[PDB]
Amino acid sequence: WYKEYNEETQSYEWNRYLWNRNTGIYKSEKKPFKNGACPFIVSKLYTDELNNYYGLFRDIKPMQDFI
Amino acid sequence: MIEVSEVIAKVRERLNDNEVGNYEILDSVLVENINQALLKICLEFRLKKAITRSLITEEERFLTLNNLLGIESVKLDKKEIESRNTIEKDTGELELLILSDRISVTPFKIGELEVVYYTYEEIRNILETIKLPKICLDVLVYSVLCNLLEIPNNETNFSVLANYKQLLKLAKDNLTNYLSLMYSKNIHFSKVVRV
Amino acid sequence: AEQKRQLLRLLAGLNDESLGMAVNRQSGVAIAQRKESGLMGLQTFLKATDDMDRLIFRLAVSFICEY
Amino acid sequence: AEQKRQLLRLLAGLNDESLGMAVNRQSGVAIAQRKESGLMGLQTFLKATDDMDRLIFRLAVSFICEY
Amino acid sequence: MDFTTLQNDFTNDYQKALIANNEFLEAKKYYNGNQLPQDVLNIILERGQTPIIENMFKVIVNKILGYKIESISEIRLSPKQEEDRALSDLLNSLLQVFIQQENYDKSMIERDKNLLIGGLGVIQLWVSQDKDKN
């Protein structure tokens, strides 16, 4: 799902490309939702440096390893 | 530096054999015993460290050292060599092969060897000179003298040997004092453990 | 092992164990009620879930008002 | 280690642990209410947040009354 | 106003604020588990030991920020005179579209995390107007 701004209207729209590696593009559709809205809602808990998601696992992992 | 003449003279005096004409103990025997004493002294105290930096290829695979006592560090192209072996393992981790004063690398790899080891520079003539600190004189005498006292010249030779053992222990204490004063740090406090 | 077993519950925000008190604190849903606060350690996780729910319902309202 | 673990909570102002009491002290929002004071150690942080909120809303009122 | 004084004043401001930004990045690394130095990690790993990091102050910051998440403060406006009330009750109605937007709680919690981990809190405002006179 790619965010690209149009040239007819000056707003961003999301377009869908179903494709395979080393095969090419299977199906390409542009603005397939009548508003150009991305269907995904993402949230990252505990973003850190080097742009990773940290989670609750890493701070409680050495206690589990010591146990 | 210690001359062999003075070691020999002290041993001759101590053995009640300071007679030029007679020489009940042949000088070959004394030089061999002095070689043995140098062996033991240089092994126990790690007196002589030597560094050899050669190259091993497929043509010549072994590095011939001389008067080897021990290896304390091996580098191959500035890479640490970890284990030591004498069996010529075919493959696996990279180990140092020791073949009784011949050094190679077990799963052989072309390169260079930088080896730190220990040496004798043993003597063969009475007119030679032992390149050791003068403080090492008494440990050479008292150690070679215990090697000769156990010829059965007298019925009380072993008690005399026992006395010379304590004298040798004191001489070794002096030598350790000297070595610490030379090749050790002048520190008066320890450092805190950092983990 | 017992110390790290207690520290495992401590590090995940499960100290001040009042979850059973907090769920009985959410009985009053009358007209105008707040969160009726219990825990503090897990509040980052609850806030991230709240923000993702707000984004989800914004996208769902944008779909419902369009299709 | 246990002493420094208690001193970590002490040095951050989390002594007098009455945060659960303090959030239930903020139920009365009727007409004219004060802070209804709990903690003292974290009050510098709360006061700095209050002053930055006052500056933020002064700038926001200056934008709203202009644009 | 040209490139010369902009570059010189940026250099003077960046070099005099490097010792605090380094401590800010150290604090953000300590908050995200990276608490041991490189030589201590090497000393631990040379003995075949697994380095255990007790992130005992992440739960402290999480407790203070958990207090601040539900105690998010808004600012209401009150009239000074009696005639200003019709202004203020107007503006309190106009600040609600600034309050109940999605970015408000995110910016406030990021602000409090930056004020607690480090020392700085920076919040910017913008007056964007998209397409329909909004």
UniProtKB/Swiss-Prot annotation, chains C, D:
Source organism, top-level taxon: Viruses
Cysteine pairs bridged by disulfides in the record: none
Location of the protein in the cell: Virion
Subunit structure: Homododecamer.
Biological role: Forms the portal vertex of the capsid. This portal plays critical roles in head assembly, genome packaging, neck/tail attachment, and genome ejection. The portal protein multimerizes as a single ring-shaped homododecamer arranged around a central channel.
Name recorded for this polypeptide: Portal protein
Species for this entry: Helicobacter pylori bacteriophage KHP30
Full-protein positions shown: 336 to 402 of 602
